[PDB]
Amino acid sequence: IRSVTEEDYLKIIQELVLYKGYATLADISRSLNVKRQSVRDEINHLISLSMAEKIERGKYRLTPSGDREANRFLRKHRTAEILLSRCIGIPWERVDEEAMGIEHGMTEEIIQRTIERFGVDRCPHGNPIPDPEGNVEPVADVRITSLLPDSTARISRIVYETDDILHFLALNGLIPGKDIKIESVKDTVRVLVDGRSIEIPTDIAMAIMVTVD
Amino acid sequence: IRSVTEEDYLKIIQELVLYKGYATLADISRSLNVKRQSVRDEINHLISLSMAEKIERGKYRLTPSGDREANRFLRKHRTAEILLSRCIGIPWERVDEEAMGIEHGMTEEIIQRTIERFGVDRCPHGNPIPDPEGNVEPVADVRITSLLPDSTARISRIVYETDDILHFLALNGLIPGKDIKIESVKDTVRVLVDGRSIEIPTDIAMAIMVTVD
Ligand SMILES: [Fe+2]
Ligand SMILES: [Fe+2]
Ligand SMILES: [Fe+2]
Ligand SMILES: [Fe+2]
Numbered sequence: 001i002r003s004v005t006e007e008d009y010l011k012i013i014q015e016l017v018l019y020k021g022y023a024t025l026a027d028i029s030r031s032l033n034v035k036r037q038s039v040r041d042e043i044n045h046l047i048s049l050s051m052a053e054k055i056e057r058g059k060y061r062l063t064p065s066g067d068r069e070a071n072r073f074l075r076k077h078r079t080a081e082i083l084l085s086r087c088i089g090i091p092w093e094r095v096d097e098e099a100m101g102i103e104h105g106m107t108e109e110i111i112q113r114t115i116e117r118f119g120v121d122r123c124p125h126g127n128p129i130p131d132p133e134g135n136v137e138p139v140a141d142v143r144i145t146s147l148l149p150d151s152t153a154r155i156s157r158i159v160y161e162t163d164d165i166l167h168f169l170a171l172n173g174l175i176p177g178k179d180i181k182i183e184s185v186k187d188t189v190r191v192l193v194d195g196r197s198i199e200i201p202t203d204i205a206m207a208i209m210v211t212v213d
Numbered sequence: 214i215r216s217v218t219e220e221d222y223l224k225i226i227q228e229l230v231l232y233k234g235y236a237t238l239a240d241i242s243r244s245l246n247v248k249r250q251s252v253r254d255e256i257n258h259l260i261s262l263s264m265a266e267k268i269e270r271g272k273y274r275l276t277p278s279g280d281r282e283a284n285r286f287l288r289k290h291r292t293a294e295i296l297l298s299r300c301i302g303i304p305w306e307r308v309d310e311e312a313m314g315i316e317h318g319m320t321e322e323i324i325q326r327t328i329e330r331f332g333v334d335r336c337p338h339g340n341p342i343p344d345p346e347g348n349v350e351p352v353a354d355v356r357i358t359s360l361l362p363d364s365t366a367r368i369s370r371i372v373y374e375t376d377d378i379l380h381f382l383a384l385n386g387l388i389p390g391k392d393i394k395i396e397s398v399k400d401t402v403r404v405l406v407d408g409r410s411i412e413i414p415t416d417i418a419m420a421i422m423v424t425v426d
Contacts, residue, residue, distance in 0.1 A: 002318065087300035088326045101318025105215065109311060113301045 010070035019160035022059035068134030076106035078123035093166040126157030126176030153210035160207040223283035232373035235272035281347030289319035291336035306379040339370030339389030357421040366423035373420040
């Protein structure tokens, strides 16, 4: 669809790091649908601008300043999602994708009127909206994969927002604000939610943050 | 703010032609805040792509195919205005400006959900939203400057949407759907609207289309 930007790279690297601890060229390539050589050129570029750094062979993350630049973009991205979701009913599982076109043009005027009109400080998937400088409130949540059987918690945010992921979460009502109880962690993470028992596979579970009671 | 695009040129040339019959380099330069040499280069480019044509010395308009390409962009522009105006209350007089950032990313998904959610076929300033191919319903309106004293009419659309213009119209309630009566045309166009008498200066009046009864 649209031509890929620096901001799109920042966004996916930040997600991947939250999700699995690192970003690889191949993961970025596949997520952005950009050939690996271009991804390599952009990663080197981000590194020479002190926006990103190599963790070890083939693994990268954002620097602190890169992470705050990501956050300044995510303020636009997340508010676009709110706009699209609350105004016109773009489905919860589609709104991350549909926000792509309009997000670069979100001005502070639009962002702040949106925030105040709908009275929100999180995107539909529970992530906080960073302030204009790229800061975010520290939040007290943890990985759902860290909890033991019989722990109870509340879904906080979905840190990695893909298609397979959002769809599964939507289908099973595993959304921000939902109370859950851990039934099992063997092989999958099985939870009690809305009276139903749902097995969450590891690749999906890794994206789920929760707040314990 | 944002870097100027081909679409911005199409938009202003189309407006200027509706407004005064032609676009000059100097009018485009001032409207887009782009130096005259760059405007000259872009106009020549539009001409060599058969998107625009020279009327006479120093005066240009869009070709029919250029006008339909303009319309395809204006579908995005106008729906962005509706989104911004109806969702978050961006003021009627500001919404043309604020739409600038987000309009290029309006997808058909967003556009059509917006159109159907708010049930509109015109932008807040009364212009029709063209279809995806760049066609517009022919409309039966005329220039308010064409009417004689004692004619009655209804404001149809504001074809040229600047700051000085929209503000004056807003301030005086001269908006799409308002019934008016021509009192005078000497020097200004003076109308009866909402029980008040309002002189409309020529430079503003030229932007106003109406439908007669
Ligand atoms: Fe998102
Ligand atoms: Fe989100
Ligand atoms: Fe407009
Ligand atoms: Fe408009």
